[PDB]
Amino acid sequence: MACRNDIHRYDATFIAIYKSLIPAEEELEKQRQLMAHLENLVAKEWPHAKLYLYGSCANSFGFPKSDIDVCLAIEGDDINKSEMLLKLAEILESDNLQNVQALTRARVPIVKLMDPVTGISCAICINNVLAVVNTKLLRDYAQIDVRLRQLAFIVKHWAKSRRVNETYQGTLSSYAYVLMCIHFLQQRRPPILPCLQEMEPTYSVRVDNIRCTYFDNVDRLRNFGSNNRETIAELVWGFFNYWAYAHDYAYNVVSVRTGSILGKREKDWTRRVDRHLICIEDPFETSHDLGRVVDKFSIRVLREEFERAARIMHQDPNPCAKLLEPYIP
RNA sequence: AAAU
């Protein structure tokens, strides 16, 4: 199947959606205000702690009204994150922050809050420093070619509109969608993005026993994708066509780390151990399949939505608006 | 089953 030959009639509609999702500078100032407020609070409780922003508010892919993610980093070998987060939830409530919720039995313990002063909502985790590093990797990829943020914005907005963007309900995180978008652009001919982890590296850090190494001098690559002249509507059609009809769900793994497709058997992801129904390898924690949140029920919904998206992109006379229509049972 |  070849891309529809009228595809460029729809580029402008997708650019307009992308531009509509860029956060307002006023919202970014409110993020900084809440971060400084939280830094002050934590400094009285744990003066030796340090706070780091990560996730959508720091990786270039944030939407308007996106929560800020904060990593509370603290040294020690006997750190009990649940006891810390329960103490922090009480400190947050006593400072008059709202909707403070501590989930200390989840896989990654977390406390959530909403600030009525800045209107910004926030989630805090303890010592998940790896997330700060993969945030930098995504931020560095985003500097290489504007089409990455454009495609990722359309895909993330689509996933929210079609209700397939919540790991608690068995669908995919925004971080997973951004990795899928990076991998798709790595595989274009010619490629729109390089494989930074395969290049001669300029950056390397170790967190826990995991070394994170890649070429991060991305200012040298600002025109890397210039040999590829594909437009945004072409890439949106191609992305959903891949996941709808080309991806081998039973056997294949998409790997931003290598810019290639790996085998499930080669990854030892052949059966649930951690389900492995739509395999997306984390670039640094390579034992982590980001699709493991998807189960034997939600995989059917995801694939059905991929097929709907691909067919809309190929055949609908107004594909941008139709693609993003909400699902109404 | 809840972070990135």
Author numbering: 425 to 697, 700 to 755
Copy text verbatim from the article accompanying this structure deposition.
RNA uridylation is catalyzed by a class of template-independent terminal ribonucleotide transferases (TENTs) or terminal uridylyl transferases (TUTases). In Arabidopsis, HEN1 SUPPRESSOR1 (HESO1) and URT1 (UTP:RNA uridylyltransferase) act cooperatively on unmethylated miRNA uridylation to trigger their degradation. In addition, URT1 uridylates a subset of mRNAs with short poly(A) tails and is negatively involved in post-transcriptional gene silencing. It consists of two canonical globular domains, the catalytic domain and the central domain, separated by a large catalytic groove where RNA substrate usually binds.
To further explore the URT1-mRNA recognition, we co-crystalized the URT1 (410–764) with a 5′-AAAU-3′ RNA stretch and obtained their complex structure at 1.8 Å resolution. In this structure, RNA bound URT1 in a canonical way with 3′-U sitting in the UTP binding site (+1 position) of URT1, and three other adenines sequentially occupied the 0, –1 and –2 RNA-binding positions along the catalytic groove. Unexpectedly, different from our and other previous researches in which the structures of apo- and RNA-bound forms of TUTases are basically the same, URT1 experienced a large conformational rearrangement upon the RNA binding, with its entire catalytic domain rotated by ∼30° from its original position in apo-form (open state) toward to the central domain, about the joint region of these two domains, to form a more compact structure (closed state). In the URT1–AAAU complex, the 0 nucleotide-binding position was occupied by an adenine (A0) representing the 3′ extremity of the mRNA poly(A) tail. Among the URT1 residues surrounding A0, N552 provided the specific contact with the adenine by forming a hydrogen bond between its side-chain group and purine N3, while V532 made a hydrophobic interaction against the base. Unlike the +1 and 0 nucleotide-binding sites, URT1 possesses a group of less conserved residues for RNA recognition at the –1 position, where the protein–RNA interactions are dominated by hydrophobic stacking. The adenine at this site (A–1) was perfectly sandwiched by the side-chain groups of Y592 from the central domain and L527 from the catalytic domain. At the –1 position, we noticed that both the side-chains of L527 and Y592 stacked exactly with the pyrimidine ring of A–1 but not its imidazole ring. Clearly, our results showed that both A2U and A2C are weakly tailed by URT1 whereas A2G is properly tailed in a pattern very similar to poly(A) but with somewhat lower efficiency. These results are consistent with our above speculation and suggest a conclusion that L527 and Y592 help URT1 to establish a preference for purine over pyrimidine at the –1 nucleotide-binding position. More strikingly, the R531 from the SSL loop largely re-orientated its side chain with the end group of side chain shifted by 16.9 Å to form a 2.6 Å hydrogen-bonding interaction (salt bridge) with D700 from the central domain.
